[PDB]
Write a protein that binds this ligand. Structure first.
Ligand SMILES: Cc1nn(C)cc1-c1cc2c(N[C@H](c3ccc4c(c3)S(=O)(=O)CCC4)C(C)C)ncnc2[nH]1
Length: 168
């Protein structure tokens, strides 16, 4: 259960590893994997496309049924759906996409959703092509998340700049 291996503990509740979140999910099968989702839950590329493809589109079919019945999420919001073969549950969380003009204050609201789950495997919200400064996203995670979060960052160069900023 939640057999995370090779993480570096940054704070009492935040751990980090240079790894592909999809490979971590297949190995660990955590209770909750966080998806870096968008408001209409269309998993077209990046982390979301990679998680969806590893479920062989089961994630997208289920997401389409959620949107039909409930409408889109809001920026900073989330929903819990099945984790399929990757986890017991997937927490779809919408961080702001600053590359498309969304506000950075909503990154705190996005991280707040992690607090409803005791243990989560997660990506660095709003990083990559969402355009937020990745070190700033780590600082928001550290100040906001109180439950136990295992961050998988699939880039050694970025992993080392995060750990360097955090420890020195
Ligand atoms: C793509 C891909 N293809 N396959 C097969 C695996 C992956 C893969 C990518 C990836 C990952 N990337 C990081 C990241 C973090 C957050 C966001 C993005 C990207 S984004 O998709 O550009 C926009 C949404 C927010 C980078 C900063 C290194 N972090 C962990 N696991 C990952 N797995």
């Amino acid at each position: 259960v939640n057999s995370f291996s090779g993480y570096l503990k940054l704070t009492d509740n935040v751990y980090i590893k240079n790894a592909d979140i999809v490979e971590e999910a297949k190995k660990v099968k955590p209770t909750v994997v966080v998806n870096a989702a968008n408001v209409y839950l269309k998993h077209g590329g990046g982390v979301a496309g990679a998680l969806n493809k590893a479920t062989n589109n089961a994630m997208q079919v289920e997401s389409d049924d959620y949107i039909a019945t409930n409408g889109p999420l809001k920026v900073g919001g989330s929903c819990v759906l099945s984790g399929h073969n990757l986890a017991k549950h997937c927490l779809h969380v919408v961080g702001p996409n600053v590359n498309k003009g969304e506000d950075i204050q909503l990154l705190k609201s996005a991280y707040e959703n992690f607090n409803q789950h005791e243990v989560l495997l997660a990506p660095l919200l709003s990083a990559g092509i969402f355009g937020a400064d990745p070190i700033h996203s780590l600082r928001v995670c550290v100040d906001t998340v109180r439950t136990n979060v295992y961050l998988a960052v699939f880039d050694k160069n970025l992993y080392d700049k995060l750990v360097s900023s955090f420890l020195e």
